[PDB]
Design an enzyme around this catalytic site. Structure first.
Site, PDB file in Angstrom:
ATOM      1  N   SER A   1       0.810  -1.184   0.000  1.00  0.00           N
ATOM      2  CA  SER A   1       0.000   0.000   0.000  1.00  0.00           C
ATOM      3  C   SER A   1       0.872   1.275   0.000  1.00  0.00           C
ATOM      4  O   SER A   1       1.652   1.418  -0.940  1.00  0.00           O
ATOM      5  CB  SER A   1      -0.988  -0.122   1.157  1.00  0.00           C
TER       6      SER A   1
ATOM      7  N   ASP B   1      -9.780  -4.436  -4.327  1.00  0.00           N
ATOM      8  CA  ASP B   1      -9.193  -3.480  -3.405  1.00  0.00           C
ATOM      9  C   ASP B   1     -10.064  -2.233  -3.296  1.00  0.00           C
ATOM     10  O   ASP B   1     -10.315  -1.578  -4.301  1.00  0.00           O
ATOM     11  CB  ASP B   1      -7.805  -3.077  -3.913  1.00  0.00           C
TER      12      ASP B   1
ATOM     13  N   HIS C   1      -7.714  -5.579  -0.283  1.00  0.00           N
ATOM     14  CA  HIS C   1      -6.465  -4.813  -0.157  1.00  0.00           C
ATOM     15  C   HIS C   1      -5.320  -5.601   0.485  1.00  0.00           C
ATOM     16  O   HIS C   1      -4.153  -5.317   0.206  1.00  0.00           O
ATOM     17  CB  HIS C   1      -6.747  -3.535   0.639  1.00  0.00           C
TER      18      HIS C   1
END
EC number: 3.1.1.101
Length: 262
Positions: A132, A178, A209
């Site tokens: 991320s 996601d 995610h």
């Protein structure tokens, strides 16, 4: 002969397995230098010096989220450092600085006779990974330090998707469903911005995610691809060219793209 080639000739089975050929040990960094905390995973019997990889978590997240990569990569012949950031709320540029500080400390420990990794690292061969905002940080690290040999972020997020300057080989793991850094607005635009490197985009079917995090249900494929990418580009190991560049032809993959790879 390739001076960086380590381990036996790879197969799909050997790359999909829980572990590679080398015994792995780990230690907690006693005095983290420029980041919050770190765990170093290393092979005890790689048969030569190996490259180093630094891995960073996402916003609010800690080492637990990316820990699985440590033993998985180290068992194939890499020194891997997983970090906690100075603050769980650090942004991508700060995560990049801390990732590079972790690589620096691995290089420091390589020259420290009391460290378990003394003389085990080739400090000229390094890679970056992360989840991320930590994936965004890995791309920033690659853009700012082109001598890095590989970058393999997962479910990346960044303030700007424009990484047109990146010359470092980039494998982007994406998670189909996601909702934090959507593929269409984050991973895919990042991938499309890069025209000067070996690159790959691998989207996991139905993935949230956290689809490439510790405990994920796709460690066979994701681990195969991550190891193959690092082997091909950090070690210049052409025994891994097909594994690194191929479309896996897997029902677990919902989107695949690659360029300047084979």
């Amino acid at each position: 002969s390739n001076p960086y080639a380590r381990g036996p000739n790879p197969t799909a089975a050997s790359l999909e397995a829980s572990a590679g050929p080398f015994t792995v040990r780990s230690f907690t960094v006693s005095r983290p230098s420029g980041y919050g905390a770190g765990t170093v995973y290393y092979p005890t019997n790689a048969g030569g010096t190996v490259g180093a990889i630094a891995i960073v978590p996402g916003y609010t997240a800690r080492q637990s989220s990316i820990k699985w990569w440590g033993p998985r990569l180290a068992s194939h012949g890499f020194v891997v450092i997983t970090i906690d950031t100075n603050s769980t709320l650090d942004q991508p540029s700060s995560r990049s600085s801390q990732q590079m500080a972790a690589l620096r400390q691995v290089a420091s420990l390589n020259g420290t006779s009391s460290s378990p990794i003394y003389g085990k690292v080739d400090t000229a061969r390094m890679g970056v990974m992360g989840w991320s905002m930590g994936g965004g940080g890995s791309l920033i690290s690659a853009a700012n330090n082109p001598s890095l040999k590989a970058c393999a972020p997962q479910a990346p997020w960044a303030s700007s998707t424009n990484f047109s300057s990146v010359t470092v080989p980039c494998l982007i793991f994406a998670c189909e469903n996601d909702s934090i850094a959507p593929v269409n607005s984050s991973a895919l635009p990042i991938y499309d911005s890069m025209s000067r490197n070996a690159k790959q985009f691998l989207e996991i079917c139905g993935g949230s995610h956290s689809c490439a995090n510790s405990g994920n249900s796709n460690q066979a494929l994701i681990g195969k691809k991550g190891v193959a990418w690092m082997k091909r580009f950090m070690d210049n190991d052409t025994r891994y060219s097909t594994f690194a560049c191929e479309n896996p032809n897997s029902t677990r993959v919902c989107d695949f793209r690659t360029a300047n790879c084979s």
